[PDB]
Structure 1
Amino acid sequence: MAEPLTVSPELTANYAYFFDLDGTLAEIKPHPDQVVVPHKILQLLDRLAAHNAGALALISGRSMTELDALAKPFRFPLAGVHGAERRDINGKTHIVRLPEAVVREVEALLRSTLVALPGTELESKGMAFALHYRQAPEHEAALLALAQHVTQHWPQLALQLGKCVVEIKPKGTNKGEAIAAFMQEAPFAGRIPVFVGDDLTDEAGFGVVNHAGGISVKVGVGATQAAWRLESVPDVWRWLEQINYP
């Protein structure tokens, strides 16, 4: 149902841009630390933001600090950990905080199960936990049942499924509310939201962008709620280049 995106918006239109990172602005890698956004693409994003009053943000499941490393030397408004971390246009950061006992008890729980799930990696994010299983796809059903049971015993936590990852996040955190928080703040407010993403976490953003009369763009294959689709990360780059230089 999603329509192939072919038109590039004009550089000085009234758009507010929201970009996912992994699988959208950067190609998918076997390991997250090999992921890179080419410096040419970062310059296009920075020029696009500059012509749109700074209304451009990165909306990612990665931690805020990892986004700053990937976007170096540029510093954009950010949503990290699916919205549990956020940095507005004023550089002000907002952090969702979990009870210290919850973080300690859950991490100890998840770590003890890894001996029976070899190849899985537990990434601790301060207020969230990510279970990476790209090196062992067989563990996916177990990690889902395990994380689902974590969210039942600790109702402060919610489930976030993703590409080769099962993520445990604070309840009420999602990229839709992250985009919402931005859309009521000075630079983004009064513009039309454009959100480009590729994973299940991005579907929540697609929903609020569609309801807002904005432009939602799915990257890659799979069922989507987005109205528009790009076929691959290099197609995002080419779309980005055509906005900057028609």
Structure 2
Amino acid sequence: RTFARRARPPAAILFSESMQSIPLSLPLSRTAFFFDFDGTLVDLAPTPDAIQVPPDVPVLVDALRQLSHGAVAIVSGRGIDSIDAYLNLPGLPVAGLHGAERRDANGDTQRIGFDDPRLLRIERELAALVDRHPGMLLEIKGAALALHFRNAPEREGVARAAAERLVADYADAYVLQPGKMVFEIKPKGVDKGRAVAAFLNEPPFAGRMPVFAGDDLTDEQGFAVANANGGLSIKVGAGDTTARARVDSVAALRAQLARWIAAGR
């Protein structure tokens, strides 16, 4: 009785399942761009509050946004408000907190897990933990928490055991997200891949070839979704990855975006 007629997909480029060379150019108005922030567009700093955002970063993101007609999103472990504080690009689509909050292209923001009483109980136990361990840093991120040990590397074991134990106490609602010198605790059932897939179901992203660039373990789910959709996954820096392409550094990734922009306009 009913059919499922589709329009020919706007994507004009497909990447196969193999390692790939980063293209010289991309048809910017048929491509969707998803970027992690720390360690990807901006260098990782000794603490989250110490990152330095060069002026090139907002200029390049905004030019990509213009030339692609809005199909650029930040998909970060930071909160949306933090990303807004550093780029000040009004109305930029942002998935923050590994997908626990997302602002779509209309500017509507959805959040999950904020004000959850269990997070406050987890937070209180981690606060006591970092009290006993100088050099560890507890970062409170709205609906998520980050247990940093970059300045106490000898405490990686106690950070892991504490975070794994608290997550297990609330395993129905929370999940662990390891990262470089950090363990983050975040609501269950949201991730960077799901956030990318949600963007790709909405204008202006829908039907376009996706690009995803990231540097850490959380980003592998973004690479997975970009690959499943025939797109281009770019790992920044060293490490095993499912990304199809790799660049050495934040500067080298930045340089790729700059070339795509120049080739476009």
Would you call these one fold, judging by a TM-score over 0.5? yes
Q: Quickly say closer, same or farther: Cα 1:188–1:61, change in 2 above 3 A.
A: same
Q: Letter of the 2:51 partner, please give it.
A: V
1:186 alignment partner in structure 2 = 203
Q: Is the 8 A contact 1:5 1:230 kept in 2?
A: no
Does the Cα contact within 8 Å between 2:41 and 2:254 map onto a contact in 1? yes
Secondary structure of the residue that 1:122 maps to in structure 2?
Answer: strand
Q: Could you list the per-position Cα deviations for residues 122-166 of structure 1 after superposition, in whole angstroms to 9, with x for gaps in the alignment?
A: 111121110011111111111111111111111211000001110
State how 1:11-30 maps to structure 2 within 5 Å.
12-30=28-46
Are residue 44 (structure 1) and residue 63 (structure 2) matched?
Answer: no
Match of 2:182 in 1: 165
Per the alignment, residue 110 of structure 1 pairs with 126
Equivalent-residue separation in structure 2 for 1:187 and 1:73 (angstroms): 17
1:201, distance to aligned residue in structure 2 (A): 0.2
Give the gaps of 5 or more residues in structure 1.
none
TM score, norm. by length of structure 1: 0.95
49-58 or 101-110: which moved more? Answer: 101-110
Does the CA contact (< 8 Å) of 1:2 and 1:224 recur in 2? no
Quote the Cα distance in structure 2 between the aligned partners of 1:182 and 1:36.
Answer: 28
Q: How many residues align?
A: 246
What does residue 7 of structure 2 align with? none
2:13 maps to what in 1?
none
204-213 or 109-118: which moved more?
Answer: 109-118
- The answer to whether the Cα contact below 8 Å between 1:4 and 1:230 also exists between their aligned partners in 2 is no
1:42 shift after superposition: 1.4
Kept in 1, the 8 Å contact 2:29–2:69? The answer is no
> Residue 70 of structure 2 is aligned with which of 26, 49, 54?
54
In angstroms, what is the RMSD of aligned CA positions? 1.7
Spell out, residue by residue over 1:160-217, the C-alpha distance to the aligned partner (whole angstroms, 9 max, x if none): 0001110001011210011011010110001011000000000011111111111110
1:153 aligns with 2:134: no
Give the stretch that moved more between structures: 79-88 or 107-116: 107-116
Alignment of 1:132-151 (within 5 A): 132-151=148-167
SS of the residue aligned with 1:140? helix
For the structure 1 residues 36 and 11, does the alpha-carbon distance in structure 2 shift closer, same or farther, using more than 3 Å as the test? Answer: farther
TM-score scaled by length of structure 2: 0.88
- CA drift of 1:76 comes to 1.2
> 2-side partners of 1:5 and 1:76: how far apart?
28
Distance, in Å, in 1 between the alignment partners of 2:188 and 2:62 is 32
User: 1:239 corresponds to which residue?
Assistant: 256
Task: Name which of structure 1's ranges 232-241 and 34-43 shifts more when overlaid on structure 2.
Answer: 34-43
Decide whether aligned partners of structure 1 residues 243 and 107 sit closer, same or farther in structure 2, where only a CA change above 3 A counts: same
Unaligned segments of structure 2, at least 5 residues? 1-16
Point out the structure with max Rg over C-alpha: 2
